[PDB]
Design a protein around this ligand. Structure first.
Ligand SMILES: [K+]
Ligand SMILES: [K+]
Ligand SMILES: [K+]
Ligand SMILES: [K+]
Lengths: 259, 259, 259, 259
């Protein structure tokens, strides 16, 4: 019953006090790792002796590395405890939580095994990006988040086809804007993929203003694009809200069945 | 029964396997033509021997022309098969799908017959714009798109009058903004059609920022315009959503009648 | 029965053919006057002999004046016919439609009586602004517009208090943004009324970008302002939509009572 | 019965005429103080003899100080009357209205006791900011505002977790945008807290345009951020509206129970 006791402790933390305190320690270390990742990029100061303003992750590289390795050790010990104390280890490994944990902890091990090629450029940037995934471990630390996830999975097809319609609208508007605006002086509409940016910024009603039409036809089609974006701000809400509310009522009915 | 067999194959592709595979080939060629049209405008590179960075559609003009003519041949053979194997050929020709197909394939034939006047300027740009219509042939490759089309046709009058009210609001706000802002130094509000752009960008809550008021009265009326745009982002949703939901329930009731 | 016959012709145009054709002529002249007012500000061309690009309303001043006086004559004859053929003339004069008609036609008569002081500056600009009100005469040429007007009148108190809450939010955010951003170099936050513009542009999710915070505290409070604007885009919709739908159902019930 | 008479006069102003007129005087002085605070920052003019354009609160410092001290005297006399004539003085002091009143009136007394250190910098700015809280005393002068406050208190947990999800989305998008855009020339994405601003401006569909991506990966992730903001403009509305409507129906049912 040891393995099942440990798995019961992990899966439902509130069942015990030791399990719940280990849960809170794990959540605290997740927050520490996220805050350290965010903070290590802040330029701390001039650091006299160096002209460039070094980030906190380079002026204090050893301290941040110690914090990161403590967090990664905690995460990997937790992962090994979960995997070795699961009713079905393969089912655990294939699960979304497990792959998130592995892809969160694994960049640290690549950085360890790339210590010989310390002059790596670009790949380590992708590894540090993938280190953002440690925030997703807060999914175990919420309940409405899983409700939203189930709602999204139930709206996967509808939202996918809505995105497909949005994509064809993007292509149409980008084509017309590129052809209407390719002739302007020093125009940013240098291609249709270049007008993808303008179209996606216009139909979301951002309007950064870096790419704006400068021709009469371009302005007319930009106005049509804006009006289409007004409807874009209302096309996903009905399906999403209706599906979420249906799930809400169904969950309440399940609760009353259990009661 | 040959003509009716071919028309049954075309209209409902899933009835057979040959019809469905020809359907998927046609959809694949539609996607190929759309991607080629989007890509041919991307500047591929310096192309040594030419100072200007030529687009992919001009450095590799022969390859893109071969791809385009293969796609157009497939489309026109499909169109002839559909027209010659229809229960009512005139009804086919007048249909929206047929006119979309014709206006998609016809710019290629104009480009063929304009090969003598290869120095054409402007008209060929419009032809290449109208080549975007090949994306619309994906309408046959969706089911919710037709539901949205029927909903739009049922909301044609309501949305038309809503657009008319939006237009009168645009005219009013453009007039007041032009008269409040015509006196500024190097102002972009050079006319009321010039303020149409500012009004349509403001009431959609884009705010590009190229045209902003610089006078106190201009800023007051721009604030009123912004507040009106807040309501603009909510005026089409009730009619559109209510009509679409009514169509949804009516379709479900039709399904249950058939069941 | 002459006066009542004329008033029946005016009030319900569809009752006859002469009344309906006079209605359509009046609507056509309203559209002509609106289009002429919009077009007279467009710079037509260089007009050789003058360096400045004169607007259409000044290069062709006599033609636009003739069109304007024809439109004003039609409008004032219509107004006199309505007033002299009304069941209660005072009730007509106090009505909103009558005041709109008078304030639309009256700037022309001021321009006539100000022909001696043709060098007027500023006041004539306000008169030309008030000439925009001729668009509002399209209210008689719609039915859903009156439904929206009744809905607005029924939501007058709720929308007024919502605007009051929006105003107190504007004042709070403008105060905090001004005090956080008054110290920046060449800052646009020169006063709290100056930050009114930033606050109203931010809580409507325009983001023109002319006034942006440049301090950390300013950016924090701008983020709070943006998040508040997200709720601003949803605070008027429930009251407006609920009231409009209640009016819709009540009108349908009235129709069924009459049936 | 004196204390209870005074407290009944304060709590429900409409019970009497003296209580209601004192209520209206208090509201008028609140509006006077708010308008004076807003106006004292407006640059009145050149004020010959001084090169800088002094604000109204410094060219006319004595008049604004007299107005402010009259308003503060009225507010503190009202506060003492409320506290000394309350059924439970401690319950009054701990109440939200009381702390708002105290923090509104108290900056004036700090300014009095800091008259020796008149060269204070920064702290007095915070005091003048906290003087904005006098607007909140209009909470006693509304009824729907308390309905919104109760609705917010009932949605405190749901909106808090929604803000937490928005925060994790902000962190993820800021990380990816910083790492995609840190390499650009003179990029504003100098850190992840620096990209917090871009992310919060993008997911609210502001698009100021001061920080825009300049790399292909940055533009792709900015497009994803924009699409997420489209859903952000719809995630708080269902919970807020449903809770507010439930409170509405419950209040109507309470009214009918009392009837
Ligand atoms: K902008
Ligand atoms: K927006
Ligand atoms: K915007
Ligand atoms: K914007």
């Amino acid at each position: 019953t040891a393995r099942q006791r440990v798995w019961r402790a992990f899966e439902n933390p509130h069942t015990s006090t030791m399990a719940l305190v280990f849960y809170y320690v794990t959540g605290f270390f997740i927050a520490v790792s996220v805050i350290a990742n965010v903070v290590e990029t802040v330029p701390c100061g001039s650091s006299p002796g160096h002209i460039k303003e070094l980030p906190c992750g380079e002026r204090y590289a050893v301290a941040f590395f110690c914090l990161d390795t403590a967090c990664v050790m905690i995460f990997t010990v937790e992962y090994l405890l979960r995997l070795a104390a699961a009713p079905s280890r393969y089912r655990f490994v294939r699960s979304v939580m497990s792959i998130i944990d592995v892809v969160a902890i694994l960049p640290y091990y690549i950085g360890l095994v790339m210590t010989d090629n310390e002059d790596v450029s670009g790949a380590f940037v992708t590894l540090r990006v993938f280190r953002v995934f440690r925030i997703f471990k807060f999914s175990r630390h919420s309940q409405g988040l899983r409700i939203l996830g189930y709602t999204l999975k139930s709206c996967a097809s509808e939202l996918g086809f809505l995105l497909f319609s949005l994509t064809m609208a993007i292509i149409i508007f980008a084509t017309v804007m590129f052809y209407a605006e390719k002739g302007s002086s020093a125009s940013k509409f240098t291609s249709i993929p270049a007008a993808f940016w303008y179209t996606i910024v216009t139909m979301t009603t951002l309007g950064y203003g870096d790419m704006v039409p400068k021709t009469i036809a371009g302005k007319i089609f930009g106005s049509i694009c804006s009006l289409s974006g007004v409807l874009v701000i209302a096309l996903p809400v009905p399906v999403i809200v209706s599906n979420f509310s249906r799930i809400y009522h169904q969950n309440q009915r399940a609760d009353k069945r259990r009661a």
